[PDB]
Amino acid sequence: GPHMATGQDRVVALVDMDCFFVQVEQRQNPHLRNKPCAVVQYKSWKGGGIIAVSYEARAFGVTRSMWADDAKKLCPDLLLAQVRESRGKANLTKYREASVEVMEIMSRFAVIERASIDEAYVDLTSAVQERLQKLQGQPISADLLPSTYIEGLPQGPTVQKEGMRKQGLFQWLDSLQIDNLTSPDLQLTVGAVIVEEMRAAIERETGFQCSAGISHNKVLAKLACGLNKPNRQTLVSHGSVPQLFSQMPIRKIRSLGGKLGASVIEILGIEYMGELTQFTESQLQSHFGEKNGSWLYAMCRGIEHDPVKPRQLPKTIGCSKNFPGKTALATREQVQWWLLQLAQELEERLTKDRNDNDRVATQLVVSIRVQGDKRLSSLRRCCALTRYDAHKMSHDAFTVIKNCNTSGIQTEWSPPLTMLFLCATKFSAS
Template sequence: MSESEERIIALIDMDCFFCQVESREKPELKGKPMVVSQFNMVLAVNYEARDLGISRFVRGDEAKEKYPDVNVVSVPERRGKGDISKYRSAGAEVINVLKQHCPIVERASIDEAFLDITDLVDRRMESTLISSSNVEKYLTNTFVVGYCDTTNDEDKRYDGMKKWINESFDNMGGEQERKLAIGAIIIEELRSEIYEKCEFKCSAGISYNKVLAKLACGLHKPNKQTILSMSSVPELFSTLSVNKIRNLGGKIGMAIVEKLNCNVMSDLLCFSMDQLEKQFDKKTAMWLFNIARGIDHEQVKSRLISKSIGASKNFWGEEVITEIQKLKAWIDILSEDISERLEQDLQDNSRRATALTVSYQYVRDKKNISQSRTSTLTSYKAEKISSHAFDIIKKTMQTPVSYLKLFPDLDNIDSSIVELLPSELQQEAKIYLKSNDKDLDQTNV
């Protein structure tokens, strides 16, 4: 058994998080169809609204016109752009609950966190008499891949879960399956505590690594959790599209489909390491070889605070920037936001940013072209940040500008740039940065 299979990893994912934050603030909205929009663009849709047929990234006024019963709530605005600070604070509440019980919590986004619960599971197994009957009664919202269908049918869930537990705890069952069951009990408890203390419902995936936990989490929602054992991976991968796997939603996933003619994950099993290395670098080839078999060695890293602080603004339609004066005005606004948050972060977390990356997109031939530049950050004063950012961007500025972002690096230049790139470009960026050239051009990202 590989070392990665000895771990028990979970992903906690808040359901329709922005909508839950709003309904906690406005209890009269609970149970009613709701969308959260920013500048009239729908960002979050609760399940009641989804049942009406509403999806994300439609216009808020169009959703209201087509579905009069939907409640449209706008993200607060500050300095002319969306202010998500209350959602960020709500996410921190959840992290505070998790860190009281689990020593290894990695905050993956504003509404997601990976947990390595291996030690918690081992301690529970050592201290508690465990049998199939006393496991079953605690898994009231748990699905098991391979033992239920893709629906949330309760009867099928219960029958499948009961069958899996009986098999896992009989004489032929394996220790890892029993550990997954105990891990699922722990996650059921954590999810209940999150709801009790924060009033937020969440879904979860429990497996042996981050990729499988992420995949399992999305299979049954909302307010459900799913176990994915290694024995169920082959059957799942036989029908799972390549782009459904974490890190394969972009260019590498497209290359797998186009170059290797792989449409589902099990197709990758046909390729040897030598064949994969002819198409990808050695590290990527090894990762693809392993992940086709459900193996991923990436560890959950303790991180309770965001690794980055950024301020950005999209400019839609007629709002695109064509004049340098307007560009400077928006850089001033974003710099004020960055300055304020950096000072607060320094006070809260005793860390200091060492570099500043300025990223923008301009429109050419109806396509968004991305550019980024990084250099040393020497001051937290808003006017200094603004002047510095403006000096960086004006050297390469092309119009019209449709997107602008400033993000300081809180650890080191390499990790800041790479981790803020789309996942499919991260390996390419790491190789690029080793050349010691701290300017990074991104085209058609």
């Protein structure tokens, strides 16, 4: 009753750039704008692998993981932009630099946690407090929320998309208790006002459109963000959770899309997130461990405590390349040449990172995959990273992996390597 916490203490948003690599290419090349298009890596094998798809192309069934030659069968007019190649491998610098552009704008409004190259969480609790003091009990006009959806509304006693959106927003704003500075629904609404402003600033200063979710925690914010894409934002209130979760497949919740979510479904004999409420916390802990069990018990009630970490920069800087099928590396010269290519890209990125961000990596991690192993990584070994020098890094990586060579011959490498990966980690201020 009066002591049951409801997880309404924070306002958290998740901002995700719409089809991000596609938008970067469309900004650069206006001929791609408002077209079915996709971004591909490489070209020789089946036209290259698609990694990002504009919403126009998605309407034809084009998806990530498609080969471009297959996507062209669904969408013959599909336009393609290729990722840059440097030192024989894909180079994603253009997109990393664009991400920094966006993250720096977001950081003007609040502390952010970089979750990926194109998404960031925002803790808006204090900004909402501020804006509420400024508003002086003034109601919130729908004009301040021109792209906001209220999940679960309209409900109760027009046939266009935007008309629906506005009816739901009107129902929400009519029920609002604006004289209560501690109303969670009011704080979420002010949070959405701020996120509209943030999204306006991103689009004005970069050209890029994004979607966003606003709720009381990171999991609900991420889920909300996905509800209305693209170029829209969604508010998921605590009250909306029972109906939302009542038909929500467990796999749609971040961290439950893989084996653990499959075991929740199998062991408990349920399908939807809301069904989890019928188990005790001890029951869930017994099946899924203390940590997961407690997390599931709270999360199916809309409650989650994971903080927005103040981290705008990646924790690791890595370079990797697959060598599939026939291209697997089978000679020592081959392995050394590619280790050097990877190390040269890594040195370039590390030197720029040291200049930009006043930090130095201290550990080099070397990972390989060998032909036939089903695991993505077959071997992972770390060594000291003492100098940003590509020849030294590649020699060290070769030293830490050299005893993987089964070959009785010094020159041959067996069994051949299908993946090389170098990662710089454990940064210290400098």
